[PDB]
């Protein structure tokens, strides 16, 4: 089938029972390529880089997952086999090219397996996140969604000096109260900057947080800024207390 | 999505056949869940071939009867989710069917795309998936075959062919019933009224060809089953004719 045994299952969970209004979610947790897929044609280089996941991003969720007490829901295999924050019909989702890099094992793909990574990766994680917001609305809690991004410092020939993206679709609620929070920290802190919903990265915010009003953000850190363990704990208190302080101004 | 009368996406009948066949029967049922009321559309389109392959699921039931054969099926209308079609066909939440705008699939957002495919196409999909699995856990034999009825007029001409024998880059069962219905009293033809051009082997893309199973889609002309006898007719027909193919090609 499509998982070995000891792979295990495609969506991780952690703090399941956690008390905090705020649902982590990351979509680029893991570099975990399925055995199936060997290399999918990729160097030993490219497979360990970035193209594989977001490095850093589900350290960095984890800690806030301590820090607010706060559900975390994750993927557990690489977005070069199925990009979870993307829709079946976006050539992203199952992408052919990573910047420079071919990908073999993405060509051309025909349909039974377009669907096996779909049914296997992408509709299992948005079932379990949707079926824990549909668990906390009928027990009257507050969500607030929030995705947990990492990007690389150098695309396309320019370096991005932009630190912290707070990232948003047509609900700019909690992204608002972040960005003014924001104003005079020593982060450089951008709204919908390196990506926006104009780049179709706001596809998670579209599927749960859109069709239930409810408050939402999706976070980018440069990857550089949370490259070992001390930066990010320092990266998660930063983001916890400026999402803190936010949804406290948000609910006055 | 559904309400509670409303049941399951996905039927199955005769679930532990010992049948080496195993029907599938995308376009079985008009019902429209009722979150969606009428899509926006009339009453006599509601009712027409437009929601359903009329015919299919009766011959389907009849053929699941002759073969021992476990029967999957689409409780819902094509018009919501065509499950014989991928997600990024625009023929899998329709805009328009054939000459028919549907007002009720204009401009699906993100999250309704998700909901139809999360609740009609995977689990009927992964079902008839599993089902093959299976089978071949159990080192059994299995042959993927697809139930579908089309209706008898086209551009203001009555199609000629009355029994269409469907497939993929796989002829080899195909070829065996058109060599078998030699002199049939039927019109049997290869992918006529449509073939893989036309989007209709999703099914056997998916669940026949990556293991080589010996697989086919009939297509029956809907005025040729429009009633129990005619029914019984065409599923006899078949069959024999499927029967002796199998057999020929062991």
Redesign the interface.
Known sequence: ?FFTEAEGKAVGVENAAAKGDVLLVCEHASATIPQKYGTLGLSADVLSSHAAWDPGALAVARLLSEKFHATLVYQRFSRLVYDCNR???SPSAMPVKSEIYDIPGNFDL???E??AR??ALY?PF??RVSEIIAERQAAGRKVVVVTIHSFTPVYHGRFREVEIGILHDNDSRLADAMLAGAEGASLTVRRNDPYGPEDGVT?TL???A??DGLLNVMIEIRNDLIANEGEQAAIAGFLHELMGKALSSIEE
Do not use: G
């Open positions: 089938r829709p079946p019909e025909d349909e039974a377009r669907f779909t049914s509709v948005h079932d596809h579209r599927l749960h859109l069709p």
